[PDB]
Design a protein around this ligand. Structure first.
Ligand code: DGL
Ligand code: DGL
Lengths: 227, 227
């Protein structure tokens, strides 16, 4: 049977929620044995991703990701890293250790190609600094970058609210305002933590916003994506 | 740092919820790196636990648990199996592979010793058949066994409602009735799936019921229990 390996904990809250999603969106028909087999390394003690860029110690972090990928390659058929900013370590990893990997950037890029309207990239300043989406996406011109002012306002929301486990709906008003400002009905979860907002939005049947959320897509299309 | 290993998927829904609990009850103060490091093997394709007792094939199931314990012993400092009925395989496992293990039966037994009033054991017929709680607990006389009629009614709730992911509150009325019938204000989660009820109960501030729920206890007392 096919096994997804999640290198998570770079949002312990969101890693927990991601696994909930996997079974929410793949309910069994008769028996539980039908349902997805998953492995989760939820290690919060990964060095802070943006903070490791802001100080000198990017090597400490790349070493973390590399070691845990070697583990997961032995155990899982496909692999996902539970953090967009964490993808910056990938150019420094051996190509062989990334055969099973599923880039959250690539999953967003595909979704955005099909959606085909301008969309607001919500992400941590460290994701922005590394330009992971602008450098990684075929659809990079459809991405609307936040101004530096608003990148910090988003960094606030992620760390102060979402990662702490507070009600994702609490920032909904602030996001609707941003979507209005930059003049769009859609956003990209350029910070996996916005998986928590996407779920809260879908719960209340709020259809006005189109979320391009890689974790939601990986969950929903598990059966197709995992071989 | 200390690592909990969860052999889960014997309730994929509840395994997902258990990991959510771990971070709900251990929120970080300053930084995420503080938060618990956890590994989860959520493998629903474990043979049905009660069904493996009801047919001949208990060896197929014990082999499953044994293989995955060998894996987890190499990776985690403490280990938890996410299913009470699954604990029946333990007498057939080597003693060495169970040093790191934390019996859900033992955790319930301790909690019940401190609570010290009669308490209704809610569990699958397969747990009951194997007498895991009556044979495993120092406090076995404080346990109130369900009648065979009500064991099937509980088996219904677990498989039809809880494992499918339906609102645990939907069975609250049926449980209050059972608690009244057997004349007690408390229950034991003899089926890890009742972790889902305990959480839903705590959410609505329903204090009338005292839940002895091993997963909730392991979550809340993570820092103390994991070395
Ligand atoms: N969560 C990462 C950024 C912060 C982190 O590494 O946890 C993301 O947006 O994908
Ligand atoms: N969930 C198990 C019983 C059914 C199962 O193995 O999933 C428990 O009550 O601990």
């Amino acid at each position: 049977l096919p096994i997804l390996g999640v290198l998570g904990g770079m949002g312990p809250v969101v890693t927990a929620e991601f696994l909930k999603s996997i079974y929410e969106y793949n309910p069994f028909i008769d028996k539980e044995q039908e349902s997805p087999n998953v492995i989760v390394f939820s290690f919060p003690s990964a060095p802070d991703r943006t903070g490791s860029i802001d100080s000198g110690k990017e090597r400490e972090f790349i070493d973390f990701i590399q070691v845990n990928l070697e583990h997961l390659n032995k155990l899982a058929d496909c692999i996902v890293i539970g953090s967009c900013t964490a993808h910056y370590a990938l150019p420094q990893i051996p190509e062989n250790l990334k055969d099973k990997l599923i880039s959250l950037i690539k999953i967003a890029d595909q979704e955005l190609q099909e959606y085909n309207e301008p969309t607001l990239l919500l992400a941590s300043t460290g994701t922005y600094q590394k330009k992971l989406f602008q450098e990684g996406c075929t659809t990079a011109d459809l991405i609307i970058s936040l101004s530096e002012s608003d990148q910090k306002l988003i960094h606030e929301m992620i760390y102060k609210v979402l990662k702490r486990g507070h009600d994702p709906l609490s920032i909904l008003r602030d996001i609707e305002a941003l979507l209005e400002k930059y003049n769009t009905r859609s956003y990209i979860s350029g910070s996996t933590e916005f998986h928590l907002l996407t779920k809260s939005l879908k719960l209340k049947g709020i259809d006005s916003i189109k979320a391009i959320d890689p974790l939601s897509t990986i969950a929903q299309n598990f059966s197709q994506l995992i071989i």
